[PDB]
Ligand binder design. Structure first.
Ligand SMILES: [Cu+2]
Ligand SMILES: [Cu+2]
Ligand SMILES: [Cu+2]
Ligand SMILES: [Cu+2]
Ligand SMILES: [Cu+2]
Ligand SMILES: [Cu+2]
Ligand SMILES: [Cu+2]
Ligand SMILES: [Cu+2]
Ligand SMILES: [Cu+2]
Lengths: 467, 467, 467, 470
């Protein structure tokens, strides 16, 4: 006579979803096998005066119901002013915190701020190393990314990026090309600490929004040094170890780094029509440069397939496609060559933009997000990652954000976030026949979510290899 | 072959759930027909520096999906420090704000703080008048309750309560009895405004916890004037009009007020073994007293059946039962006589604490929360409200809080709130055979929830007649 | 046969005196041409529960007998406890109100509380802008000053000051030097309002008394943050426009601000033996610092001559003198250099404390208060403002407070205030030979007084350029 | 002079070494001024002592051998709806109830609040305050509760208290006084332990404010709220015969005064106010605590009541339906039942309620009287000078708004009065010399005074202070 919602959860498995809430100031872990929120944390309870809880990633735990740890960062300053909400805090906290939090099988415990430990505050993507011995954060206001040790929260290595435009006019500063400098970033305070917490280091006063390359070009992004911006987004990891890849939105390139030797080794060229790579040039032991003759399109999402055989970078806005390299040679990234471009008429406009992805465990399919400004329906596209073609797209609702998959490959679980002021939900889609199974309440503005991994292998399709 | 959670929502009807989040700092509306959150709001975005979003009530709307209005208040000061969250905020806000918020079919819009408009801040139960033309708020730190005008947010009347113990020793201050003064409260400021915002008027530094009557007695509740406390809880309304009833936890009584004439008219005596009523004595045109020879037990929950034939007050300290009056004579509340007591051998002093309830539309059943401190499972009792007997007790999880019902009477929708740091959820129970259908995620600390009513008749079983 | 007092008033001219009354809780306007009080207002009539009516300034009116407007603020909290009056109020109001009052040719009319309109409550000196289009208030419990718009009572700009002492011990916190931060203070509530009414923001629980820097250093001033105090006193105006100057008692400096561009531009070093200026350092677009090696003396009175050519700051603790700068270069205050110091063998350490002044219209002479604790006769010093020397000292009575001048420059009109409990009067002195013409009754504890100006030029010797 | 400027000191030098004291009504303050220098000597603000309705009302000062070294005085307060009847748009909707009787000492430096005598005795009273001619006590009356009492100076306990009640021939507010009735005079005894009354604050109030000038029209018209307005007589003051023995209670509504024997604690006579009535009405004894007086009809209310300084004349002003000064020969000190009307001071300028003549002061030799002429805004108020040998008006002088009380320096040279702005406009102290009645001018006074005194030095000084008249 009555439907029990427990029948829906029994099919999902014993998986734990975790998501931060952006303007909500909260972070929450949910039991997909019962529908309970397991625990939640509100950063204002800890004196955080701008708790835009932003990106996150969770370390593997063999039983997340018993305990797991995760990293979540924050944004501050004028990031508070760029969504639809008529906020009244004219002088908010500066954000760029890197919180370490541990779920202990009952509650969330705020452990520390790694930005205070290390001295380095970064406010965009968080990823976990494939060894689960560490994590990385990037930032597109300071243009710095770093890998941190898990035990000590100290930086292992940090890199700063800078743009030298051929034309010092914001309208032409990326389109007409320039030179990007890659600089080893070194500590300046006692104990190998950085002096780069909060707003210290910012070139621009907020992270560029979707299609925000147009806004910076039009002089509509405030900041000390926008002509010098490259808008670093993430540092993602080859699941085979050894390499990490830093993505640069404005110049449309990814930089491959040697994690052990602490040097860049390769520059992958995003836009369709460019060669596989641009030439990396060493200037001294701490300085490299790369010349980009013109920037045809900005790009954003970057990541590896879970077997490390493919590396993807999405061009967004001026071109909308998925660029794919053969990354099968683990010994030498300067050999990685463009093998395919995924294109579709689900992509003729400036929008949708595809900022997030997740692969199935066997690397044969990809789930990618399709974002538009209100009011166009946002949704998910399914990719055949064998033939590099779009299989399907599904409409869902407003402001599609991030995606995760259960580690058996059976269910994609994503977040929609209301542009911080309208409808928000968790979405579940089954991957056997790619149908939407429904939505669960989620009163948060998630710009990230994960399913807590159980093993190092699970990390390959979590917040480690892709964002 | 897969289960679609949409099949679960299709059965619930086109109902909107709204709930505040306590320590989350947020309030959210959820579409029970789709599982989407419709909109949420985070009060820190509006400069609220202690956004403990506390109680709330929603005005009827002929279509809640197009728009609706609601009222939600806040607590502050040392309320922040009495839960299991190791808060680190140094100088928290004083709370006692009374926000007016409107959903416009897309987003929540903050209208204003009524405590600023009126001058009167109050931080405990919020209820809507049966005419939907106003609302009331009670407070047990200041011991004041008031009815406010919906359009102007100005006070219609306000009453202040004081205790004068027979024995001036906290251990004996209520046990050995005393006199309660009931005092008309009038404004002092230009434009008819009160001077009672934030902590102004506070006798004690936090709202008494469940069983917290023992703490104040033991000298463990700080404040200027704890010997004078009565811990007013709510001002609930007779669904037939005319009368409002103010609940006083510490002296174990309820005061019936004439809403039109602005006078108290009756004092209902909570504990088993006391008469139906105590004698109200007029001292002057603004001042009444009531002599209580001994307080046998504190009380808490207070409410009317939806036809107003019965009035309930829960004893919840030294006794644990539901006291029931015959309130069928609408003309004269001094005639209201005790008619039944609901008892169970399961119930035992302070716990379960039965501090929330909702009736079915036909007044035949009641759903009552059963609250315990961790780790005893909390749950819901089902009460036969014709014979006055417990039908069924169901266990659910930690920290059972409020209960609402769909207006067709088919589903009870409640919240569990993890004591602000562990598991939290929305629960759904069908009322035909009283079975739990399951849980939906809710990463919030709700001490209230409503389903948005459509008509004045719907208010009879919403946040107007009971809390 | 008999003397008429009319012969005394006839000589004074058609001028209106206005004064607040401190502990009297009143404010009054007096017709110096007839001896009548024109109108008085008692703030307890308007629900003020701590009506310490403190500082005030009047806008120009072409005919003050037809109408004029003025601003008067209040103090509260523990300021009620620091004077000789054995007060018995236990819950005093917090003060920091900023009342707008209009005299309409018959009565005073309370228009509004500007601290409620703007959200910013401040309780020390009030001054009018030289354009008479706004006013400013400073506060030395919160260390905030701001300029407000006359029409809207909204803040144009507000500055918050903080002390970071070299030595974390109240005894040496100022003597051994430290760094002062100057921070742009921005609103946090809907409609651009601050959340800083009443005691919100107080670092210390009363305004420092004369010589009261010794008390804070001796740990005898209670409050949350006395190590961080700078005791801001006033925001006074260059009569030539553009610049406003905030005085800071504890670190002995004045900060010059650009009103239009809303930045600080210079720090003036008070004590004899220090350079003309300390170095202003920009930290970011909202924040500046200034390093002070040692604080040789506290300062207090600050103001411009009426032609803007001289700027004065009194040293008033460990030195007792008037420090004078050449402010003739209106374009660049960083060029303002010390040019004179007024000294006297009779002036050593704290007393006489010289905390009020008024110039003659031709700027050649200054009248300055000589204040002492009871029982030493207090009086007025006459200063030669061309040679920078004391001309004359005249003893009057107990507790000399403020000084005003008729705008023809003929009569200085001052108040004496009995330390709030003994003899009080208005004093009149003629400026040709600097003789006391006598006293008029004044049952009030005035810490301020003004003659209502008629023109912008009159403001130059009213409560605009000096306090 | 040695310079061209006028010094204000020459003005004060003529006045002598006298101290003016006044309360401030809505200002919530009281102040003492040195007329010889122009300084305020000391002032006190009742809000500093936690008073939540400091309408500082009437006052009287005990004699001091040197008031510059010390003097003591009594000042009372009003509260409740008295806060709502002036021009000020007050916002305190539930103020304190007032009816405090404060004892204050000026100790040569500062005012010290000694205590509230209403709390001591238990009896709170809000209208006129007077000093006994022996300076061993004081009295207060009140027109909301209709009670008067004499209190001991040393203990602040009540020596005797009387309650007055009206029983109208018609229980219709329009006619309750016009058509007559019976006034009861009742001995009030303490009802609490320790000889205390239970009559502080609003306890005992029949009406919710003191009747304003011409306010008898308002109570008649049902515009004055309260529990028992039909029972009102509006007692105003208890004034003293300077010869001792007798005190006189004035009753506004029924237009009579009651003469009391102070030592034996009984009423002895009832003087009938209005022109055309007998000298007296018949006092009837009912029992040892209770007397009645029959008043066939009330031709007019009255108000100011007082003795000349030699005790030979008693005066009662009629003040609504008639406007005159009624004068009795009170030269027989042994028997007030023999006091008979001897004169009536009238003027073609005095018709109906205005000018209302509610305050007076005699010169020390009793030859002249200075009387207030009060009008509502905007008619100029002033002072009438009365020849008290021929019982005629000598002179009228216009001054300003809201003329209130009058005192005189004890050498008889200068009358010092207050004007009080109706609590919201212009206020001042006024000085008039008594040889030629020339107004010498005004001094600032930012207060709403409904009283003022010069501090007396001797018992003989009290004869022309707040003892014999109000
Ligand atoms: Cu990204
Ligand atoms: Cu390899
Ligand atoms: Cu984001
Ligand atoms: Cu409750
Ligand atoms: Cu609660
Ligand atoms: Cu100052
Ligand atoms: Cu002051
Ligand atoms: Cu009178
Ligand atoms: Cu009066």
């Amino acid at each position: 006579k009555y439907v029990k919602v427990q029948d829906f959860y029994d099919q999902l498995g014993k998986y734990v979803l975790v998501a931060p809430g952006k303007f909500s100031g909260t972070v929450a872990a949910t039991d997909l096998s019962t529908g309970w929120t397991m625990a939640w944390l509100a950063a204002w309870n800890y004196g955080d005066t701008c708790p835009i809880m932003h990106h996150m990633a969770a370390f593997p735990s063999p039983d997340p119901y018993k305990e797991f740890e995760f990293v979540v960062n924050t944004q501050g300053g004028k990031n508070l002013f760029i969504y639809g909400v008529p906020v009244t805090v004219e002088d908010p906290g500066e954000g760029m915190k890197i919180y370490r939090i541990k779920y202990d099988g009952t509650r969330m415990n705020l452990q520390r701020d790694a930005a205070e430990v290390s001295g380095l505050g970064l406010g965009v993507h968080v990823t976990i190393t494939p060894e689960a011995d560490g994590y990385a954060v990037g930032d597109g206001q300071k243009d710095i990314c770093a890998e941190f040790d898990r035990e000590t929260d100290m930086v292992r290595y940090a890199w700063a990026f800078d743009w030298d435009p051929n034309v010092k006019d914001l309208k032409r500063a990326w389109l007409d090309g320039g030179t990007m400098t890659i600089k080893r970033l070194k500590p300046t305070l006692p104990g190998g600490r950085y002096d780069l917490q909060g707003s210290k280091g910012n070139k621009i006063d907020w992270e560029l929004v979707p299609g925000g390359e147009l806004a910076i070009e039009d002089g509509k992004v405030s900041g000390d040094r926008p002509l010098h911006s490259v808008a670093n987004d993430a540092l993602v990891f080859d699941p085979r170890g050894k390499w990490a890849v830093a993505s640069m939105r404005l110049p449309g390139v990814c930089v491959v780094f040697d994690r052990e030797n602490q040097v860049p080794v390769a520059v992958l060229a995003g836009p369709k029509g460019t060669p596989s790579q641009f030439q990396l040039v060493k200037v001294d032991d701490d300085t490299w440069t790369v010349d980009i003759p013109e920037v045809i399109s900005a790009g954003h999402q970057a990541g590896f397939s879970p077997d490390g055989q493919s590396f993807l970078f999405m061009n967004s806005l001026r071109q909308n496609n998925i660029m794919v390299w053969d990354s099968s040679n683990h010994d030498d990234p300067t050999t990685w060559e463009k093998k395919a471009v995924v294109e579709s008429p689900d992509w003729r406009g400036a929008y949708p933009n595809t900022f997030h992805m997740v692969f199935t465990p066997d690397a044969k399919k990809i789930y990618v997000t399709m974002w538009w400004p209100s009011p166009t329906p946002n949704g998910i596209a399914v990719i055949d990652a064998v033939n590099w073609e779009v299989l399907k797209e599904v409409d869902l609702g407003p402001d599609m954000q991030t995606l995760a998959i259960t580690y058996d490959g059976k269910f994609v679980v994503g977040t929609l976030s209301g542009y911080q002021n309208t409808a928000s939900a968790i979405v579940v889609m089954e991957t056997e026949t790619d149908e939407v199974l429904g939505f669960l309440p989620s009163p948060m503005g998630h710009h990230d979510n994960v399913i807590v991994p159980r093993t190092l292998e699970d990390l390959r399709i979590s917040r480690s290899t892709t964002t």
